[PDB]
Ligand binder design. Structure first.
Ligand SMILES: [Mg+2]
Ligand SMILES: [Mg+2]
Ligand SMILES: [Mg+2]
Ligand SMILES: [Mg+2]
Ligand SMILES: [Zn+2]
Ligand SMILES: [Zn+2]
Lengths: 365, 163, 365, 163
DNA sequence: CACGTGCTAGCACGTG
DNA sequence: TGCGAAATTCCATGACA
DNA sequence: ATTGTCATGGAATTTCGCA
DNA sequence: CACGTGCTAGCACGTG
DNA sequence: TGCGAAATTCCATGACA
DNA sequence: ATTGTCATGGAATTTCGCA
């Protein structure tokens, strides 16, 4: 009873005066629309709000309502949110109700061999002793090379890519942080040929979207071609590769082969418009196609999204949570905002993690 | 009639035997007639059997209208005739003993032969591993007659490894 | 060359006259904006469209474009879609681009014990030798009973529910087609007490939404309470049950306990508004609450949804497809339309399946 | 003062020993003071130990303000006093030898005792399994004084099994 | 050898 | 031109994960 | 230090054949 | 014992 | 009434699965 | 023969204390 001046008819900021505050049982009470409620001294409030919340680690409203049953004081929700921001278990176990910011649509690599995207499809049902496919997709064209491997290992990746680079050498190769790609042996191999390695953020396959999306197309065709037949895919990759490389993208009106070369080879339903032009007049037209390719814009932001700001408190989706374990790490801080969707955080362990915002939620309160 | 283009004709021949480079005795030279672009496949024999292994890889990338070659065993066999026809590739043969191509191909086939022979005695019995470089080299070479590189002509853009 | 009258300047319906149709190589050709194209006799068309499509089992446009390279004829896409509707592999492997119709929001069970929803949470990390939780949620109130079991078996379900029915007996018990619930032994048990068994459609946990959603709430609290402690959940179910049953639903402004009884028991932050009323005046107010509970309406349909119609051709999502195997069954027919979201189909095996539309796609063409 | 309500007082006592029904010798009678609602828990002894096992289940559903009982061992122990206080349940005791409740509870406790004894000799040493029915029966019985059933009073709605 | 990162398996129940 | 049919383009949905 | 994608097929819409 | 239905595990790589 | 602050309600997002 | 759900916390909005 520190602010008890109310009992003697004094005014205290925040406390409505049209109500009457009396004393019974040894408690300061209030006559209210809801009923008669109890007003605890400021000191006892933190404790009460805690007790109520801890009953079921309830969010804002559910916590307030519990307290409403016995008590009233000014701005209870302000005292309530204070606690919710302080409950370690709620902060690290609750879901977020804020969507990621709208997706970036990176510029299509300018020329063939500006960027490779690589990934492994597998494991698959054994064929000729093989279990995986290394899928190399060129970013500009979409052209795709498929290599069967017995394992998703640096060993095999190097083995495959040496064959591929006989043709040409890429500026950049993008990949997910799959062991075989984040090896030192591979960084070596890349360095020796002067290729920059660029890696997707972890647990975020959208980044390698190009390959992943090409994977679908590879699986879809494989499947169709293996209907009602044992799944022996090895002998088919060669066919799927040629097929898919020579298949028109409706929005672009072009085939990866075309975008790579400007003319069809001796594949069936071969195009032959540029048949009367010289190779020189043909190769120029290509440059013109490659520049005026359709490109999507970023879709409109969700009504209830968020974008990361430096110094913001932000938590990382736990990689692979055990059963009955919390799905979010202890709160961290935004250091760099590499773009509206990528972030460098102070990792909980505690390093610099470059993470996608998809694996982030803004910390509440 | 209608201007020379890529994939209009692929010129093939074998080169060997050479020193046993990690088990590989021969090399299948494939050269695009118009870009001069060159693919090099190390093989263990100048057999139809391995001409197929290798040209399968290549024809999984792009497919020529015509293959031109000498009347070597590997090229005049049934199997190879049947393999060509399966894919609608016309086989064209140089008359025996008097070999032929175009100007461009003849020169490129020379370069390969020498560029191969030099980086054969300088870097001795270990040529296998170096084939990928020879290939890039060859394809990044400047054509005297045409103002461009085989890479440039084929892909239509500056290579990221100029030579 | 059946319709070759064009070569002699005759008109044939569908063939533009402003163009000129000549003959070279032994083929009927046409001078076109695109270039010079070839017109095959009607008989050769089915075959061509097939050949093109089969290259990569391409959809409409991608197939058309391939053919465009060499050929033209009137309404090629009409001949193209004909084939796509006839390619078994494409029909059973391709994804759908039509969304489900908007969800139904079933009426909240009128009274307590009208409906039970049941499900098993588990397996969990062993506690006192227990591995599963049987979760019984009453549909009207949300009141939830939690039973620890060593297995998700009829045996254990019966064992648990006998204890539960000591209190009261439900009209209906809803569950998923989990073995323990679709047993004969359980149908027996249910029959003996005159409870109707109602089952969710297969591979569709939304149907048991009430339980499933309560599961989340159960796991969330369990987790919070087990932070930084070994996962021994057994001794906690009792606490979670009381906690959760006594926790306000913000939209309803009521706790499952309240909705069940009308007054709080001796739990902390006990409500006491209805303290001055008689039990009779208290129990009436309850009836009034139970009727005027907030209820959501069905959300607006997606721009590109569909609703099932009797006699429609419709395919069922393959339960658990092996790797590189098609994700859809051979096309079937709608028999009954139980509601805009539930369907009885002629099962591919071939029975009457009551399936959710979520596991259905409308057959293309 | 303020009208009788559910969970205001729970009346407990033990009944037994009885014939060993699948190993269970006793029964813990719990009766809500105002609805007359009855819970029946079969136990192996009139011990604090098992009074707790059973009342834990019950208090996981709803929790009385007060428990009223006789001065039986199981009820006057420390453990039970400590168990009651942990949950803020006040313990009220009838003075020894002169038992007391309200009118309503006294009658219900009679019914249970007889309804138990009848479906004990009619259906002999197998009473365990039947307890759930006795319970439904009891709770669906009509109250002479009040125009309603214990079920009706507690849940506020017609039972789906009337008796 | 546990750990981080990429992937797809697997086991339990009741029933024929 | 203007009108009806045909062609072409729009696009949200889903699967890679 | 990095970032989603594109085949697909009904529906919307623009182009075309012919006056 | 394979099958349908409900659930969550698991193994492979390179690296410390 | 009218205005500023406080309270209460709106709701889309995600997790059960 | 059956059918999604609701806790959640910033943002939108309605109610309240006081003139
Ligand atoms: Mg992948
Ligand atoms: Mg030779
Ligand atoms: Mg479940
Ligand atoms: Mg006694
Ligand atoms: Zn909390
Ligand atoms: Zn097809």
């Amino acid at each position: 009873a520190e602010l008890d001046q109310l009992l003697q008819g004094h005014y205290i900021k925040g406390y409505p005066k049209q109500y009457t505050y009396f004393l019974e049982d040894g408690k300061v009470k209030v006559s209210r629309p809801e009923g008669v409620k109890i007003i605890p001294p400021q000191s006892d409030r933190q404790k009460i709000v805690l007790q109520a919340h801890n009953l079921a680690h309830t969010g804002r409203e559910a916590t307030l309502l519990k307290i409403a049953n016995l008590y009233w004081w000014p701005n209870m929700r302000k005292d309530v949110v204070k606690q919710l921001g302080r409950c370690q278990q709620c902060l690290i176990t609750n879901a977020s109700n804020k969507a990621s910011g709208p997706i970036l649509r990176p510029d299509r690599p300018q020329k063939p061999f500006d960027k490779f995207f690589i990934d492994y499809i597998g494991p698959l049902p054994p064929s000729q002793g093989y279990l995986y496919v290394l899928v190399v997709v060129d970013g500009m064209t979409g052209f795709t090379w498929l290599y069967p491997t017995k394992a998703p290992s640096t060993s095999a990746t190097v083995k495959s890519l040496n064959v591929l680079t006989s043709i040409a050498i890429p500026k950049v190769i993008h990949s997910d942080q799959g062991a075989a790609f984040t090896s030192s042996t591979f960084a070596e191999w890349a360095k020796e040929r002067g290729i920059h390695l660029e890696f997707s953020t972890p647990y975020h396959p959208q980044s390698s979207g190009k390959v992943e999306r090409k994977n679908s197309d590879i699986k879809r065709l494989l499947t169709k071609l293996l209907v009602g037949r044992p799944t022996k895919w090895y002998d088919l990759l060669p066919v799927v590769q040629l097929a898919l490389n020579n298949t028109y993208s409706p929005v672009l009106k072009y085939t990866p082969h075309q975008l790579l070369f400007g003319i069809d080879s001796n594949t069936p339903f071969a195009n032959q418009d540029t048949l009367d032009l010289t190779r020189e007049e043909e190769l120029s037209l290509l440059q013109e196609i490659r520049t005026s390719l359709y490109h999507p814009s970023t879709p409109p932001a969700s009504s209830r999204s968020w974008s990361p700001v430096v110094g913001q408190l932000v938590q990382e989706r736990v990689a692979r949570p055990a059963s009955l374990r919390p799905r979010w790490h202890k709160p961290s801080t935004v250091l760099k905002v590499l773009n509206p969707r990528t972030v460098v955080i102070l990792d909980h362990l505690g390093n610099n993690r470059t993470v996608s915002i998809d694996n982030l939620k803004p910390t509440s309160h | 009639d209608r201007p020379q283009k890529p994939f209009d004709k692929f010129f093939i021949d074998y080169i060997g035997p050479l020193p046993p480079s990690q088990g590989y005795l021969y090399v299948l030279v494939v050269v695009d007639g118009m870009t001069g672009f060159t693919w090099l496949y190390p093989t263990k024999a100048p057999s139809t059997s391995a001409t197929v292994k290798s040209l399968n890889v290549l024809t999984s990338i792009a497919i020529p209208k015509v293959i031109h070659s000498d009347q070597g065993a590997a090229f005049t066999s049934s199997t190879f005739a049947e393999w060509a026809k399966e894919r609608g590739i016309h086989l064209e043969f140089s008359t025996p003993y008097h070999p032929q191509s175009s100007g461009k191909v003849e020169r490129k086939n020379s370069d390969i032969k020498r560029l191969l022979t030099k980086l054969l005695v300088g870097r001795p019995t270990k040529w296998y591993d170096l084939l990928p470089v020879v290939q890039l080299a060859l394809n990044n070479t400047y054509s005297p007659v045409l103002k461009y590189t085989p890479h440039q002509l084929l892909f239509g853009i500056d290579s990221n490894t100029p030579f």
